């Protein structure tokens with residue numbers, strides 16, 4: 261596999277880089293791209309680690325070199341929010357960045373699996389899809405909004421509440437990636453039960469976890485190291501599936517049948533061509549049904565904002 | 573085990589943090605300290621990763637909280653060099669930082685195993701030893717200059733030359749950590765042979781690898797991600813030995829019998845009390861014997877500079 265990381269010099273990009281360098285299968289290639297001029301030196305730094313993964317870094321305005329022959333592209337370029345901001349407040353700086361980078365992907369490697377990490381994900385994934393459509397090159401099985409951080413956050417918060425080993429708990433999370441649209445499916449966590457007070461409290465802690473880190477960093481940024489970890493998990497799942505491994509399933513924000521919104525995050529069976537099947541969200545509790553119904557008008561306004569930017 | 577990282581908000585500290593969070597044994601504690609006010613937020617970021625390792629971060633002028641009950645302390649605080657500088661040029665900014673932090677270690681956790689990562693290591697380790705002596709608390713089996721990056725750099729450079737799997741080659745490196753005092757023992761690499769031209773060229777590439785990254789980053793710093801990786805390897809070796817694991821051996825810069833200089837890096841058998849035995853450097857080639865003899869006056873000037881700072 262070749263994996264390209266666009267936005268490699270940032271806080272997220274460097275942590276992701278470190279993890280992919282040390283965890284990608286033997287024989288893999290990793291290319292790093294960022295406009296920042298330190299980027300080739302980030303690749304040299306990493307190239308001193310003894311693993312059988314070839315790494316090169318690229319700088320400047322053209323990402324073509326990084327993108328040639330890429331199977332997976334992971335996009336983490338863009339600005340972080342400051343205390344007192346919402347994710348949607350990032351639209352004005354980041355919409356242009358994502359539009360610019362996906363046109364480059366559309367020209368150079370239109371068959372790659374593309375993971376959008378750039379905030380606000382609910383909207384930027386729709387920007388990506390519209391760009392790829394205009395280029396005559398959209399495949400809805402190969403475009404992903406990366407929501408994996410919500411998953412590993414829920415796993416951590418549940419295990420500590422319920423006295424479980426953190427690596428042993430997996431919770432499904434559906435919806436989107438904003439404070440209102442993150443819905444952890446706590447009724448479906450095997451082997452654990454929660455009171456309704458535990459469900460309310462946990463769901464809030466999970467929805468507000470991004471603002472918790474932003475507040476804690478005090479103007480020094482948002483989640484970088486945990487997000488690096490989450491994105492490396494998703495990327496390695498993509499790579500595993502693309503190499504033919506069976507039964508790899510991840511939740512991600514993806515264009516589907518539209519039963520709830522155009523884009524919606526749900527569990528997905530991954531295969532050699534991207535998403536193999538979009539799995540059922542299953543049976544919801546009364547809390548979960550209610551939370552879902554309540555999020556739906558905010559979700560599709562997020563989507564329409566993205567499509568607007570590209571189509572007007 | 574409790575492991576404390578002093579200098580946790582820097583480029584090295586954050587990569588080290590990420591790796592220790594994800595790789596330390598279940599039941600471990602990790603505390604992060606830095607004067608930078610973002611540090612508690614670095615710990616919150618990391619605390620969202622689902623592993624059974626407790627993490628807390630501390631800021632301000634007092635490191636006591638981070639240091640209470642620590643078994644291993646890893647010091648990576650200090651300034652990076654810029655293009656055109658030598659490691660020794662960092663003495664004026666970094667000597668004070670190391671003196672300050674080791675006095676805090678001497679008060680709070682005098683029985684911890686201490687790894688000095690701060691440059692220039694040949695000199696700063698001697699600063700550390702003199703501080704701990706003045707505090708009546710020096711144990712020469714528990715003070716380490718961290719040279720592991722020279723090792724993993726050599727492993728990478730050899731494997732690519734000789735068509736080996738990078739994870740399968742281990743090369744002993746003795747001496748110190750400066751351009752003149754890094755001596756890779758290429759005559760002792762099992763299963764590989766080198767021409768004398770290959771030995772000269774490889775030894776140079778290895779000695780100048782730090783300047784290669786500094787040049788490549790263009791004022792954006794020195795090696796951070798690879799150094800994080802190297803320090804995490806050393807820290808996990810320390811932890812393994814302290815928990816009673818057998819036959820863990822690492823090269824590190826350590827006060828020994830003085831046959832070459834006061835401090836000298838050589839292979840060490842690690843045990844429950846720090847270094848268990850200081851191993852023989854073995855039989856040297858004619859190149860290696862010569863390189864060793866030639867480095868010795870520079871090494872002990874490095875040492876005497878450190879002792880001077882503390883003792884005058």
Ligand SMILES: NC(=O)c1ccc[n+]([C@@H]2O[C@H](COP(=O)([O-])OP(=O)(O)OC[C@H]3O[C@@H](n4cnc5c(N)ncnc54)[C@H](O)[C@@H]3O)[C@@H](O)[C@H]2O)c1
Pocket residue numbers: 266267268269270271272273293294295296336337338339340341350354357360361377378379380381406407408409437481482483484487
């Ligand atoms: N939805 C999610 O779960 C999720 C996850 C991770 C990140 N994100 C978003 O990703 C972005 C990450 O920011 P960060 O924390 O790494 O901040 P950062 O400022 O540390 O990193 C951002 C990088 O983008 C680079 N950059 C800007 N435009 C570029 C372009 N055209 N091409 C390449 N590089 C360019 C910058 O030079 C920088 O290195 C934010 O929008 C964040 O909110 C969202």
Ligand SMILES: NC(=O)c1ccc[n+]([C@@H]2O[C@H](COP(=O)([O-])OP(=O)(O)OC[C@H]3O[C@@H](n4cnc5c(N)ncnc54)[C@H](O)[C@@H]3O)[C@@H](O)[C@H]2O)c1
Pocket residue numbers: 578579580581582583584585605606607608648649650651652653662666669672673689690691692693718719720721749793794795796799
């Ligand atoms: N000998 C080796 O192999 C080796 C290995 C790694 C690092 N080093 C040295 O370690 C230092 C690492 O720099 P970096 O690349 O991370 O640069 P950086 O600037 O990114 O990080 C340094 C950190 O030190 C912090 N700091 C300064 N004084 C502090 C103090 N009193 N206590 C706590 N925090 C404090 C800063 O706020 C910063 O976060 C340099 O001297 C480097 O040359 C040497």
